[PDB]
From a paper:
The biosynthesis of neurotoxin aetokthonotoxin (AETX) that features a unique structure of pentabrominated biindole nitrile involves a first-of-its-kind nitrile synthase termed AetD, an enzyme that shares very low sequence identity to known structures and catalyzes an unprecedented mechanism. A diiron cluster comprising two irons that serves as a catalytic center binds to the carboxyl O and the amino N of the substrate.
In addition, the structures of these complex crystals without soaking with Fe ion were also solved. These complexes harbor the same metal ion coordination statuses as that was observed in the AetD/1 structure, which provide additional evidences to support the conclusions regarding the formation of the diiron cluster in AetD/Fe complex crystals. This could be one factor accounting for the lower transformation efficacy of 3.
Author numbering:
A (entry chain A): -2 to 179, 183 to 237
B (entry chain B): 0 to 178, 184 to 237
The structure:
């Protein structure tokens, strides 16, 4: 229908806005050392394990016989493994520092990482009463934002991986490629689905919110970078 | 109506109070440092509870009478996370560790129910009218008073033995938590049939999620029997 085609087109329009945010200009700027462009990496601590939990406990319904939910379960199973990759690159980048337990807690629950820490919370709340087809729209919008972020972060990440001869897993092309997926992708199923008028309206609200919340997270990354521009990652060769 | 909902909260409290974790915590034949082995588990909850109170309960864009008094109470409850960080240091649990060891601790599969308690309350609360939010908050505060009445027993024993001011596992926390109140307003309120059935669901959920957290605290103590508090004189 024109319903589903309007939804997928809205995700494209939001993606095109989202790709142009200042953070991503900065992350992509090869005239700044990759070490300085990845100074935002530790901020991901407020999101990456929350995302694991979103996939394990909010998206997944192991019991459902529903066609759409079974496809979600398969995809979420894989997407919930990426937090280990985050902790891998956290160490390689020199950001796995020894600190007091309270300093780690005060960092994650920083007022400067509120939108970062609440992105998966907001998605869980949006998703609580959605039928599987509508969760698929949530996941497609959220994955579209994710691919923009990690396509950008993989640029300095692959520069450091090549130079230090270390295998990066999270800020790395392998993450982008595995995430994109190539049994069927959600975007294939969505292209074969028609939405009611209510569903079409709910899908608009979903795409708008997922992109607004993702932009709020990126906003906090930009302000963290501004506060740390004299600092850099310290990868070991 | 309400009377039935206030009576279920007291029934749930009397059941909750009997959990094996609370018998362990109140056992004065066990050193208080051993009974507060569970204290660092509170890291997965205390700052989430701050956020629940700042962001999920509170609505700074409402004019409703019930929502106004909620906002007031959530203001005070949102300050106790600093007391948690105070007592963490006093008990010798503010350990130097890798950032990743802190993250792997809070996001432990053994603290799933502890970490998801506030999340579960936010999902439960997000579409509730304010009177029903008051029911969530009253049940939650009833469960919290059982826990902190028990924790303050070994807390105040260490506080006196070491002459340090404890703030979280301490009588002062139990006293300000308790001290117009929400219960006053609920006693004077008439629940429709539909609100009555939902208030029942809220009170059952708040106490089941709280029991699940307490279960994880008990399993933690058994899996870390060495890692007793190390307060200093
Ligand atoms: N790929 C990310 C998850 C992710 C999906 N969508 C996002 C949007 C914003 C930030 C992160 C994400 C990870 O493995 O952790
Ligand atoms: N008083 C607790 C909060 C609390 C209320 N109800 C609870 C139930 C379980 C655990 C904690 C709580 C604090 O300041 O952190
Ligand atoms: Fe990922
Ligand atoms: Fe409290
Ligand atoms: Ni996938
Ligand atoms: Ni392939
Ligand atoms: Ni109060
Ligand atoms: Ni809702
Ligand atoms: Ni352990």
């Amino acid at each position: 229908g024109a319903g589903m085609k309007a939804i997928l087109q809205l995700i494209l329009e939001k993606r095109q806005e989202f790709e142009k945010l200042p953070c991503f200009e900065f992350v992509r700027d090869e005239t700044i050392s990759p070490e300085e462009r990845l100074i935002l990496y530790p901020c991901i601590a407020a999101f990456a394990l929350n995302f694991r939990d979103l996939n394990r406990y909010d998206y997944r319904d192991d019991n459902s016989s529903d066609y759409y939910q079974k496809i979600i379960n398969i995809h979420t199973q894989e997407d919930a493994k990426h937090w280990e990759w985050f902790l891998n690159d956290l160490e390689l980048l020199g950001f796995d520092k020894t600190m007091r337990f309270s300093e780690a807690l005060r960092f994650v629950w920083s007022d400067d990482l509120l939108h970062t820490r609440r992105l998966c919370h907001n998605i869980a709340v949006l998703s609580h009463d959605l039928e599987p087809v509508m969760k698929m729209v949530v996941i497609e919008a959220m994955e579209t934002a994710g691919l923009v972020i990690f396509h950008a972060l993989a640029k300095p990440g692959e520069s450091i991986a090549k130079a230090t001869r270390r295998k990066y897993l999270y800020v790395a092309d392998s993450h982008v490629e595995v995430e994109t997926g190539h049994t069927e992708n959600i975007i294939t199923i969505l292209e074969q689905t028609q939405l009611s008028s209510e569903q079409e309206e709910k899908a608009k609200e979903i795409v708008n919110k997922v992109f607004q919340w993702s932009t709020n997270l990126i906003g906090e990354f930009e302000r963290y970078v501004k506060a740390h521009r004299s600092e850099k990652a310290q990868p070991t060769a």
